[PDB]
Amino acid sequence: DYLLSANGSKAIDFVWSNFLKHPYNPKLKQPDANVKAAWEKHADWEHWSNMGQDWSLNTPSGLVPRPNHGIAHTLRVAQLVPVIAEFLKAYSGDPKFQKLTQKEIQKAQYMMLFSVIGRENDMSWTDANHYQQAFKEAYNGQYSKHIYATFKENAQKGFLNHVVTNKSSLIPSLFSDESELQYWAEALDTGGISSASGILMALAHDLDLMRCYDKGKFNSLKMKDLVARLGGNEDAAKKLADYAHDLIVATGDRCMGYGVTQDYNYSLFGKCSLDPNECLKQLQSIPKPETT
């Protein structure tokens, strides 16, 4: 809803032009040999090649950088937020989700546009925990800065850069003042998360992970929590997950963790991933689900 507003359109262009259309950083593709060796001793950790995974994808429209955290992912998690808010109000049984006014939901949606602009590779928060621990184990206990947290700090810088550049359009219409803006900027620092808006943004992230989680991992680590958040209502959770799945299919993305699985549709994914307005058009063509 807010994505078609002037403020939404300008934020999409900002994150696309300054961050999301550009390649990952080759210096962050893999650990050094010592960190690799310490990492490999942890058989329960996903392999360090996670750092270099999903680097780029050839499509008929062009070579798409950061295909697993690009404009299609960004716009989908933003598009999910208002629908998730409706499901939480209808099915959670928790009155705290009545604090989700339109203005609150719009801020949460807006934040999603900035949710991956700091990335310089595709690694997860858990991957970065592993790099940091493997570094400690390889180098006599030495400290190293958490890579994923650094991504998030860089995203906060870019978010605040855009907002101050457009402050008269965004305050007080979206953020009431600089103090409220500060709280929302700090909410980009995602690592339980107990606020209504925080839960809302977290569920958008969690749903879209069906693009890159297998079914066992998605069902265990994401679906169980969503069902419980909707008051144990599995039917409602499936309606919401079906909508996330349909947004993925609408943008040509891969779907591994839920529903009718598919590899990339390279033509459609390239068209959406290289043109934010086309991506948004395809997203909005998907009907929203109904809540009882």
Short mmCIF file of all heavy atoms in Angstrom, two decimals, residues 231-292:
data_model
loop_
_atom_site.label_atom_id
_atom_site.label_comp_id
_atom_site.label_asym_id
_atom_site.label_seq_id
_atom_site.Cartn_x
_atom_site.Cartn_y
_atom_site.Cartn_z
N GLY A 231 -2.30 -18.21 16.88
CA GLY A 231 -3.15 -18.93 17.81
C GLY A 231 -3.28 -20.41 17.53
O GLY A 231 -4.31 -21.01 17.84
N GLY A 232 -2.24 -21.02 16.95
CA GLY A 232 -2.30 -22.43 16.59
C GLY A 232 -3.09 -22.73 15.34
O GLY A 232 -3.31 -23.90 15.04
N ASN A 233 -3.51 -21.70 14.61
CA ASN A 233 -4.38 -21.86 13.45
C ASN A 233 -3.52 -22.22 12.24
O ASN A 233 -2.97 -21.35 11.57
CB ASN A 233 -5.18 -20.58 13.23
CG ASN A 233 -6.30 -20.75 12.24
OD1 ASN A 233 -6.21 -21.55 11.32
ND2 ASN A 233 -7.37 -19.99 12.42
N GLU A 234 -3.40 -23.52 11.96
CA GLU A 234 -2.60 -23.98 10.83
C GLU A 234 -3.22 -23.56 9.50
O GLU A 234 -2.48 -23.27 8.55
CB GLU A 234 -2.45 -25.50 10.85
CG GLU A 234 -1.59 -26.00 11.98
CD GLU A 234 -1.80 -27.49 12.21
OE1 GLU A 234 -1.94 -28.24 11.22
OE2 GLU A 234 -1.85 -27.92 13.39
N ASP A 235 -4.55 -23.54 9.41
CA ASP A 235 -5.19 -23.14 8.15
C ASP A 235 -4.88 -21.69 7.81
O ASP A 235 -4.59 -21.37 6.65
CB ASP A 235 -6.71 -23.34 8.23
CG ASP A 235 -7.12 -24.80 8.10
OD1 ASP A 235 -6.31 -25.62 7.61
OD2 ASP A 235 -8.26 -25.13 8.48
N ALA A 236 -4.93 -20.81 8.81
CA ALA A 236 -4.60 -19.41 8.59
C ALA A 236 -3.12 -19.25 8.23
O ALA A 236 -2.78 -18.45 7.35
CB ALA A 236 -4.95 -18.58 9.82
N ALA A 237 -2.24 -19.99 8.91
CA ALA A 237 -0.82 -19.91 8.59
C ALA A 237 -0.55 -20.35 7.16
O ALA A 237 0.28 -19.76 6.47
CB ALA A 237 -0.02 -20.76 9.56
N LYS A 238 -1.26 -21.39 6.70
CA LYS A 238 -1.06 -21.86 5.34
C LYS A 238 -1.56 -20.84 4.32
O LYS A 238 -0.96 -20.69 3.25
CB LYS A 238 -1.74 -23.22 5.14
CG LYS A 238 -1.00 -24.34 5.84
CD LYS A 238 -1.74 -25.67 5.74
CE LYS A 238 -0.96 -26.78 6.43
NZ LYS A 238 -1.78 -28.02 6.61
N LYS A 239 -2.65 -20.13 4.63
CA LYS A 239 -3.13 -19.08 3.72
C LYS A 239 -2.10 -17.97 3.59
O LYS A 239 -1.89 -17.42 2.50
CB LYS A 239 -4.45 -18.51 4.22
CG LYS A 239 -5.68 -19.34 3.90
CD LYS A 239 -6.88 -18.42 3.71
CE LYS A 239 -6.97 -17.39 4.84
NZ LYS A 239 -7.33 -17.99 6.16
N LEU A 240 -1.45 -17.62 4.70
CA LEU A 240 -0.43 -16.58 4.67
C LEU A 240 0.81 -17.06 3.93
O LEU A 240 1.36 -16.34 3.08
CB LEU A 240 -0.09 -16.15 6.09
CG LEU A 240 0.88 -15.00 6.24
CD1 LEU A 240 0.39 -13.77 5.49
CD2 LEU A 240 0.99 -14.71 7.74
N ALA A 241 1.27 -18.28 4.22
CA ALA A 241 2.42 -18.83 3.52
C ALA A 241 2.13 -19.00 2.03
O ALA A 241 3.02 -18.81 1.20
CB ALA A 241 2.84 -20.16 4.16
N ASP A 242 0.89 -19.37 1.68
CA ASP A 242 0.53 -19.48 0.27
C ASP A 242 0.69 -18.14 -0.44
O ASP A 242 1.11 -18.08 -1.60
CB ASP A 242 -0.90 -19.98 0.12
CG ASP A 242 -1.06 -21.46 0.42
OD1 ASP A 242 -0.05 -22.19 0.55
OD2 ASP A 242 -2.23 -21.88 0.50
N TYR A 243 0.34 -17.04 0.25
CA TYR A 243 0.50 -15.71 -0.34
C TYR A 243 1.98 -15.39 -0.56
O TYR A 243 2.36 -14.90 -1.62
CB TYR A 243 -0.18 -14.67 0.54
CG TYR A 243 -0.03 -13.25 0.04
CD1 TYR A 243 -0.57 -12.85 -1.18
CD2 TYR A 243 0.66 -12.30 0.79
CE1 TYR A 243 -0.42 -11.54 -1.64
CE2 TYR A 243 0.81 -11.00 0.34
CZ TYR A 243 0.28 -10.63 -0.88
OH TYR A 243 0.44 -9.34 -1.32
N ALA A 244 2.83 -15.67 0.44
CA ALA A 244 4.27 -15.49 0.26
C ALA A 244 4.79 -16.32 -0.90
O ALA A 244 5.62 -15.85 -1.69
CB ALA A 244 5.00 -15.86 1.56
N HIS A 245 4.32 -17.56 -1.02
CA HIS A 245 4.69 -18.41 -2.14
C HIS A 245 4.26 -17.79 -3.47
O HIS A 245 5.03 -17.75 -4.44
CB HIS A 245 4.06 -19.79 -1.94
CG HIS A 245 4.23 -20.70 -3.10
ND1 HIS A 245 3.44 -20.62 -4.23
CD2 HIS A 245 5.13 -21.69 -3.33
CE1 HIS A 245 3.83 -21.54 -5.10
NE2 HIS A 245 4.86 -22.19 -4.58
N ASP A 246 3.04 -17.27 -3.52
CA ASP A 246 2.55 -16.70 -4.77
C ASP A 246 3.31 -15.43 -5.15
O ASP A 246 3.51 -15.18 -6.35
CB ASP A 246 1.05 -16.46 -4.67
CG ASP A 246 0.25 -17.77 -4.55
OD1 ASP A 246 0.84 -18.86 -4.74
OD2 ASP A 246 -0.95 -17.70 -4.25
N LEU A 247 3.79 -14.65 -4.18
CA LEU A 247 4.63 -13.50 -4.52
C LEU A 247 5.97 -13.96 -5.08
O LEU A 247 6.51 -13.33 -5.99
CB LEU A 247 4.85 -12.61 -3.30
CG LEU A 247 3.63 -11.96 -2.66
CD1 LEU A 247 4.11 -11.10 -1.51
CD2 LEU A 247 2.82 -11.17 -3.68
N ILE A 248 6.52 -15.03 -4.53
CA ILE A 248 7.77 -15.58 -5.06
C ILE A 248 7.58 -16.04 -6.51
O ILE A 248 8.36 -15.67 -7.40
CB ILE A 248 8.25 -16.72 -4.14
CG1 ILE A 248 8.94 -16.10 -2.91
CG2 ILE A 248 9.16 -17.70 -4.88
CD1 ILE A 248 9.23 -17.10 -1.80
N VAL A 249 6.52 -16.80 -6.78
CA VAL A 249 6.28 -17.28 -8.14
C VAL A 249 6.03 -16.10 -9.07
O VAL A 249 6.49 -16.09 -10.22
CB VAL A 249 5.12 -18.29 -8.14
CG1 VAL A 249 4.71 -18.63 -9.58
CG2 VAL A 249 5.57 -19.54 -7.41
N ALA A 250 5.34 -15.06 -8.58
CA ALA A 250 5.04 -13.90 -9.42
C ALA A 250 6.29 -13.15 -9.87
O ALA A 250 6.27 -12.45 -10.88
CB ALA A 250 4.11 -12.94 -8.67
N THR A 251 7.39 -13.26 -9.11
CA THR A 251 8.63 -12.59 -9.45
C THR A 251 9.67 -13.53 -10.04
O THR A 251 10.82 -13.12 -10.26
CB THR A 251 9.20 -11.85 -8.23
OG1 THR A 251 9.29 -12.74 -7.11
CG2 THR A 251 8.32 -10.67 -7.86
N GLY A 252 9.30 -14.78 -10.34
CA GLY A 252 10.20 -15.72 -10.97
C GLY A 252 11.26 -16.30 -10.06
O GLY A 252 12.21 -16.92 -10.55
N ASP A 253 11.13 -16.10 -8.75
CA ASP A 253 12.16 -16.52 -7.81
C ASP A 253 12.04 -18.01 -7.55
O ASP A 253 11.03 -18.66 -7.87
CB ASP A 253 12.02 -15.75 -6.50
CG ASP A 253 13.36 -15.46 -5.81
OD1 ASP A 253 14.31 -16.28 -5.87
OD2 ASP A 253 13.44 -14.38 -5.17
N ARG A 254 13.09 -18.56 -6.96
CA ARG A 254 13.12 -19.95 -6.56
C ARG A 254 12.30 -20.14 -5.29
O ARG A 254 12.18 -19.24 -4.45
CB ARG A 254 14.59 -20.36 -6.39
CG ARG A 254 14.96 -21.36 -5.32
CD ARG A 254 16.48 -21.32 -5.13
NE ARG A 254 16.95 -20.34 -4.15
CZ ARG A 254 18.23 -20.04 -3.93
NH1 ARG A 254 19.18 -20.64 -4.63
NH2 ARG A 254 18.57 -19.16 -3.00
N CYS A 255 11.67 -21.30 -5.18
CA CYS A 255 10.93 -21.64 -3.97
C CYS A 255 11.30 -23.06 -3.57
O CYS A 255 10.99 -24.02 -4.30
CB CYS A 255 9.42 -21.49 -4.19
SG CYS A 255 8.52 -21.45 -2.61
N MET A 256 11.98 -23.19 -2.44
CA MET A 256 12.52 -24.47 -1.97
C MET A 256 11.82 -25.02 -0.73
O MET A 256 11.80 -26.24 -0.52
CB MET A 256 14.01 -24.32 -1.63
CG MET A 256 14.95 -24.19 -2.80
SD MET A 256 16.65 -23.55 -2.06
CE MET A 256 16.75 -24.76 -0.56
N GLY A 257 11.27 -24.15 0.12
CA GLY A 257 10.91 -24.56 1.46
C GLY A 257 9.45 -24.80 1.73
O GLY A 257 9.09 -25.25 2.82
N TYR A 258 8.59 -24.51 0.75
CA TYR A 258 7.16 -24.54 1.02
C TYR A 258 6.38 -24.63 -0.28
O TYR A 258 6.78 -24.03 -1.28
CB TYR A 258 6.73 -23.29 1.81
CG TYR A 258 5.25 -23.23 2.09
CD1 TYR A 258 4.72 -23.81 3.23
CD2 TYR A 258 4.36 -22.60 1.19
CE1 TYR A 258 3.36 -23.77 3.49
CE2 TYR A 258 3.01 -22.58 1.43
CZ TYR A 258 2.51 -23.16 2.59
OH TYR A 258 1.16 -23.11 2.83
N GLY A 259 5.28 -25.37 -0.24
CA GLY A 259 4.32 -25.33 -1.33
C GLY A 259 4.82 -25.96 -2.62
O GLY A 259 5.61 -26.92 -2.62
N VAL A 260 4.33 -25.43 -3.74
CA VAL A 260 4.70 -25.93 -5.06
C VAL A 260 6.09 -25.38 -5.37
O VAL A 260 6.25 -24.21 -5.70
CB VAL A 260 3.68 -25.54 -6.13
CG1 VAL A 260 4.15 -26.03 -7.51
CG2 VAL A 260 2.32 -26.13 -5.80
N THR A 261 7.10 -26.23 -5.22
CA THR A 261 8.48 -25.78 -5.31
C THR A 261 8.88 -25.55 -6.77
O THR A 261 8.31 -26.15 -7.69
CB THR A 261 9.40 -26.81 -4.66
OG1 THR A 261 9.07 -28.11 -5.18
CG2 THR A 261 9.19 -26.82 -3.14
N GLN A 262 9.85 -24.67 -6.97
CA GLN A 262 10.31 -24.40 -8.33
C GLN A 262 11.72 -23.83 -8.29
O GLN A 262 12.14 -23.24 -7.29
CB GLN A 262 9.39 -23.44 -9.06
CG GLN A 262 9.31 -22.07 -8.42
CD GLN A 262 8.56 -21.12 -9.30
OE1 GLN A 262 7.48 -21.45 -9.80
NE2 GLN A 262 9.13 -19.94 -9.53
N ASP A 263 12.46 -24.05 -9.37
CA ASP A 263 13.67 -23.32 -9.66
C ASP A 263 13.30 -21.93 -10.18
O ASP A 263 12.13 -21.64 -10.46
CB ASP A 263 14.52 -24.08 -10.68
CG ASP A 263 15.93 -23.54 -10.81
OD1 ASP A 263 16.42 -22.86 -9.88
OD2 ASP A 263 16.56 -23.82 -11.85
N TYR A 264 14.31 -21.06 -10.31
CA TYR A 264 14.07 -19.76 -10.91
C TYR A 264 13.40 -19.91 -12.27
O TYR A 264 13.71 -20.82 -13.04
CB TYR A 264 15.39 -19.01 -11.11
CG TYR A 264 16.14 -18.63 -9.87
CD1 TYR A 264 17.22 -19.39 -9.43
CD2 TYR A 264 15.81 -17.49 -9.14
CE1 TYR A 264 17.93 -19.04 -8.30
CE2 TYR A 264 16.51 -17.13 -8.00
CZ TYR A 264 17.57 -17.92 -7.58
OH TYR A 264 18.29 -17.58 -6.46
N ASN A 265 12.47 -18.99 -12.56
CA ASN A 265 12.07 -18.70 -13.94
C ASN A 265 12.98 -17.59 -14.41
O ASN A 265 12.78 -16.42 -14.06
CB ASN A 265 10.59 -18.30 -14.01
CG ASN A 265 10.16 -17.87 -15.42
OD1 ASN A 265 10.98 -17.49 -16.26
ND2 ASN A 265 8.86 -17.93 -15.68
N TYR A 266 14.00 -17.93 -15.21
CA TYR A 266 15.09 -16.99 -15.47
C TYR A 266 14.61 -15.76 -16.23
O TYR A 266 15.11 -14.65 -15.99
CB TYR A 266 16.22 -17.66 -16.25
CG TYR A 266 16.92 -18.71 -15.43
CD1 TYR A 266 16.61 -20.05 -15.57
CD2 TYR A 266 17.88 -18.35 -14.49
CE1 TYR A 266 17.24 -21.01 -14.80
CE2 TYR A 266 18.50 -19.29 -13.72
CZ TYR A 266 18.19 -20.62 -13.88
OH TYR A 266 18.82 -21.55 -13.10
N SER A 267 13.68 -15.93 -17.16
CA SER A 267 13.18 -14.76 -17.88
C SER A 267 12.45 -13.81 -16.94
O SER A 267 12.79 -12.63 -16.85
CB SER A 267 12.28 -15.19 -19.03
OG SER A 267 13.04 -15.81 -20.05
N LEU A 268 11.48 -14.34 -16.19
CA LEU A 268 10.67 -13.51 -15.31
C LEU A 268 11.50 -12.93 -14.17
O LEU A 268 11.35 -11.76 -13.81
CB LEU A 268 9.51 -14.33 -14.75
CG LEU A 268 8.58 -13.68 -13.73
CD1 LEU A 268 7.98 -12.41 -14.32
CD2 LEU A 268 7.51 -14.69 -13.41
N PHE A 269 12.40 -13.74 -13.60
CA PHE A 269 13.23 -13.26 -12.51
C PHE A 269 14.17 -12.16 -12.97
O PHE A 269 14.40 -11.18 -12.25
CB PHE A 269 14.02 -14.42 -11.91
CG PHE A 269 14.83 -14.03 -10.70
CD1 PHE A 269 14.20 -13.77 -9.50
CD2 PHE A 269 16.21 -13.97 -10.77
CE1 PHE A 269 14.93 -13.42 -8.37
CE2 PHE A 269 16.95 -13.62 -9.64
CZ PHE A 269 16.30 -13.36 -8.45
N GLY A 270 14.73 -12.29 -14.18
CA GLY A 270 15.59 -11.23 -14.68
C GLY A 270 14.83 -9.95 -14.91
O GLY A 270 15.33 -8.85 -14.62
N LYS A 271 13.61 -10.05 -15.44
CA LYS A 271 12.84 -8.84 -15.70
C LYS A 271 12.50 -8.12 -14.40
O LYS A 271 12.63 -6.89 -14.31
CB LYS A 271 11.57 -9.17 -16.46
CG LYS A 271 11.83 -9.52 -17.92
CD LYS A 271 10.63 -10.21 -18.55
CE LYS A 271 10.96 -10.68 -19.96
NZ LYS A 271 10.15 -11.87 -20.35
N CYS A 272 12.10 -8.88 -13.38
CA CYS A 272 11.76 -8.28 -12.09
C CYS A 272 13.00 -7.79 -11.36
O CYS A 272 12.95 -6.76 -10.68
CB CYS A 272 11.01 -9.29 -11.23
SG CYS A 272 9.37 -9.70 -11.86
N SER A 273 14.11 -8.53 -11.45
CA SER A 273 15.28 -8.19 -10.65
C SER A 273 16.07 -7.01 -11.19
O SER A 273 16.93 -6.49 -10.48
CB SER A 273 16.20 -9.41 -10.55
OG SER A 273 15.51 -10.43 -9.85
N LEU A 274 15.82 -6.60 -12.43
CA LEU A 274 16.55 -5.50 -13.04
C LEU A 274 15.68 -4.26 -13.23
O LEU A 274 16.15 -3.27 -13.79
CB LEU A 274 17.15 -5.95 -14.37
CG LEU A 274 18.23 -7.01 -14.18
CD1 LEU A 274 18.54 -7.74 -15.49
CD2 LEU A 274 19.48 -6.37 -13.63
N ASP A 275 14.44 -4.29 -12.74
CA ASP A 275 13.50 -3.18 -12.95
C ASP A 275 12.55 -3.17 -11.76
O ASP A 275 11.55 -3.88 -11.76
CB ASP A 275 12.74 -3.34 -14.26
CG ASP A 275 11.80 -2.18 -14.57
OD1 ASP A 275 11.47 -1.40 -13.66
OD2 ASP A 275 11.38 -2.06 -15.74
N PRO A 276 12.84 -2.36 -10.74
CA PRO A 276 11.97 -2.36 -9.54
C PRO A 276 10.51 -2.09 -9.83
O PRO A 276 9.65 -2.71 -9.19
CB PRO A 276 12.59 -1.26 -8.67
CG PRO A 276 14.02 -1.26 -9.04
CD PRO A 276 14.04 -1.53 -10.54
N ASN A 277 10.19 -1.19 -10.76
CA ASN A 277 8.78 -0.90 -10.99
C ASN A 277 8.06 -2.09 -11.63
O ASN A 277 6.90 -2.36 -11.31
CB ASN A 277 8.65 0.37 -11.84
CG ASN A 277 8.87 1.63 -11.02
OD1 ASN A 277 8.31 1.78 -9.94
ND2 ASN A 277 9.73 2.52 -11.51
N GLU A 278 8.75 -2.83 -12.51
CA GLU A 278 8.17 -4.04 -13.07
C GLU A 278 7.99 -5.10 -11.99
O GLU A 278 6.98 -5.83 -11.97
CB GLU A 278 9.06 -4.58 -14.18
CG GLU A 278 8.51 -5.82 -14.84
CD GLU A 278 7.27 -5.51 -15.66
OE1 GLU A 278 7.12 -4.34 -16.08
OE2 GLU A 278 6.45 -6.43 -15.87
N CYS A 279 8.98 -5.24 -11.13
CA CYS A 279 8.86 -6.18 -10.02
C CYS A 279 7.64 -5.86 -9.17
O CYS A 279 6.85 -6.75 -8.82
CB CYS A 279 10.14 -6.12 -9.18
SG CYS A 279 10.24 -7.42 -7.97
N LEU A 280 7.46 -4.58 -8.84
CA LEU A 280 6.32 -4.18 -8.01
C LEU A 280 5.00 -4.45 -8.73
O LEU A 280 4.04 -4.92 -8.11
CB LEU A 280 6.46 -2.70 -7.62
CG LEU A 280 5.52 -2.17 -6.53
CD1 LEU A 280 5.72 -2.93 -5.24
CD2 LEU A 280 5.76 -0.68 -6.33
N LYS A 281 4.95 -4.20 -10.04
CA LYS A 281 3.74 -4.50 -10.80
C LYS A 281 3.36 -5.97 -10.69
O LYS A 281 2.20 -6.30 -10.42
CB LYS A 281 3.94 -4.10 -12.26
CG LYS A 281 2.75 -4.45 -13.15
CD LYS A 281 2.87 -3.80 -14.51
CE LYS A 281 4.08 -4.33 -15.26
NZ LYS A 281 5.01 -3.23 -15.66
N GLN A 282 4.34 -6.87 -10.88
CA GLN A 282 4.04 -8.29 -10.81
C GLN A 282 3.58 -8.69 -9.42
O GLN A 282 2.68 -9.53 -9.27
CB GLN A 282 5.26 -9.10 -11.24
CG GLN A 282 5.71 -8.83 -12.69
CD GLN A 282 4.62 -9.13 -13.70
OE1 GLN A 282 3.95 -10.15 -13.61
NE2 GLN A 282 4.44 -8.24 -14.67
N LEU A 283 4.17 -8.09 -8.38
CA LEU A 283 3.78 -8.37 -7.01
C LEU A 283 2.33 -8.00 -6.75
O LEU A 283 1.58 -8.77 -6.14
CB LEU A 283 4.68 -7.61 -6.04
CG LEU A 283 6.05 -8.24 -5.95
CD1 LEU A 283 6.96 -7.39 -5.10
CD2 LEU A 283 5.90 -9.64 -5.38
N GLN A 284 1.92 -6.81 -7.17
CA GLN A 284 0.59 -6.34 -6.85
C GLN A 284 -0.50 -7.05 -7.64
O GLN A 284 -1.67 -6.97 -7.25
CB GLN A 284 0.51 -4.83 -7.04
CG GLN A 284 1.70 -4.13 -6.44
CD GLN A 284 1.70 -2.64 -6.68
OE1 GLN A 284 1.77 -1.85 -5.73
NE2 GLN A 284 1.62 -2.23 -7.94
N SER A 285 -0.14 -7.76 -8.71
CA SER A 285 -1.08 -8.58 -9.47
C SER A 285 -1.54 -9.82 -8.70
O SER A 285 -2.46 -10.50 -9.17
CB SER A 285 -0.46 -9.01 -10.80
OG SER A 285 0.37 -10.16 -10.64
N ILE A 286 -0.93 -10.13 -7.57
CA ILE A 286 -1.31 -11.29 -6.78
C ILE A 286 -2.41 -10.87 -5.81
O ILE A 286 -2.23 -9.90 -5.06
CB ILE A 286 -0.10 -11.87 -6.03
CG1 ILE A 286 0.96 -12.30 -7.04
CG2 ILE A 286 -0.50 -13.03 -5.13
CD1 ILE A 286 0.47 -13.35 -8.03
N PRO A 287 -3.56 -11.54 -5.80
CA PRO A 287 -4.62 -11.19 -4.85
C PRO A 287 -4.15 -11.38 -3.42
O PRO A 287 -3.50 -12.38 -3.09
CB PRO A 287 -5.75 -12.17 -5.19
CG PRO A 287 -5.44 -12.66 -6.57
CD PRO A 287 -3.94 -12.69 -6.64
N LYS A 288 -4.51 -10.44 -2.57
CA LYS A 288 -4.28 -10.60 -1.14
C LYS A 288 -5.22 -11.67 -0.59
O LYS A 288 -6.32 -11.87 -1.11
CB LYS A 288 -4.50 -9.28 -0.41
CG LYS A 288 -3.34 -8.29 -0.50
CD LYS A 288 -3.47 -7.34 -1.69
CE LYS A 288 -2.31 -6.35 -1.76
NZ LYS A 288 -2.01 -5.92 -3.16
N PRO A 289 -4.80 -12.40 0.44
CA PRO A 289 -5.70 -13.36 1.07
C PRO A 289 -6.74 -12.68 1.94
O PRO A 289 -6.56 -11.56 2.43
CB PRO A 289 -4.76 -14.24 1.91
CG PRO A 289 -3.52 -13.42 2.08
CD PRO A 289 -3.41 -12.54 0.88
N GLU A 290 -7.86 -13.38 2.13
CA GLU A 290 -8.94 -12.94 3.00
C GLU A 290 -8.78 -13.52 4.39
O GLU A 290 -8.42 -14.69 4.55
CB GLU A 290 -10.29 -13.36 2.43
CG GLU A 290 -11.10 -12.21 1.89
CD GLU A 290 -12.42 -12.66 1.27
OE1 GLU A 290 -12.37 -13.33 0.22
OE2 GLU A 290 -13.49 -12.34 1.83
N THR A 291 -9.05 -12.71 5.41
CA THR A 291 -9.13 -13.19 6.78
C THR A 291 -10.59 -13.22 7.21
O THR A 291 -11.37 -12.34 6.86
CB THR A 291 -8.32 -12.30 7.73
OG1 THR A 291 -8.95 -11.02 7.83
CG2 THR A 291 -6.89 -12.13 7.21
N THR A 292 -10.95 -14.26 7.97
CA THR A 292 -12.30 -14.43 8.48
C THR A 292 -12.72 -13.23 9.34
O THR A 292 -11.92 -12.69 10.10
CB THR A 292 -12.43 -15.71 9.33
OG1 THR A 292 -11.74 -15.53 10.57
CG2 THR A 292 -11.83 -16.89 8.59
#
